[PDB]
Amino acid sequence: AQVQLQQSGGGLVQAGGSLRLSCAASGRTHTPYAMGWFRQAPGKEREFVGGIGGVAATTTYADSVRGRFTISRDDAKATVYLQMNSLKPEDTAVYYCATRASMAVSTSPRVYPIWGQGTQVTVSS
């Protein structure tokens, strides 16, 4: 692979809690390229959460996470973050970052050829 994505920072929190995930990229990195966050809960397909792309770090969000989750990036560290607030039990899933050779963010996981390892996030009621 041209690029390797290493994820950090999940765990188990109570409803209303916060977590921050990181996705550190190494290899032939290019920070304007799209980084997507996707999650997969038990029994479900990979659902798009949000993405970041472009020379100006523009973000886009799924309806179910807007306002609560925030995506950012540190260019010099080649790292993209997913800040999660007001967490809900329904947010429980394995979270993945993924990237592709385009600035454009897509909702389809299938157009991202490069995947991080996944991080479990679990939210108690």
Ligand X SMILES: O=C(Nc1ccc(Cl)cc1)Nc1ccc(Cl)c(Cl)c1
Instruction: Return residues touching ligand X (CB under 6 A).
Output: 2-3, 25, 28-31, 33, 35, 73, 75, 78-80, 99-101, 113-114
Q: Which does 3 bind (CB under 5 to 8 A by kind): ligand X, its own copies, none?
A: ligand X
Work out which of 30, 64, 72, 113 binds its own copies, going by CB under 8 A. Answer: 72
Of residues 46, 53, 65, 73, which one binds its own copies by CB under 8 A?
A: 73
Alpha-carbon distances, residue 86 vs 4, 27, 30, 55, 111 (angstroms):
30, 34, 32, 29, 30
Residue with smaller CB distance to ligand X, 71 or 92: 71
Note whether 40 and 108 are within 8 A (CB). Answer: no
- Per-residue burial over 50-82, b = 16 or more CB atoms within 10 Å of its CB, e = otherwise: bbbbeeeeeebbbeebeeebbbebeeeebbbbb
Binding mask 106-125 for its own copies (x = CB under 8 A): -----------xxxx---x-
User: Which tokens is 56 given?
Assistant: 């100006």
Least distance in Å: CB of 84 to its own copies? 9
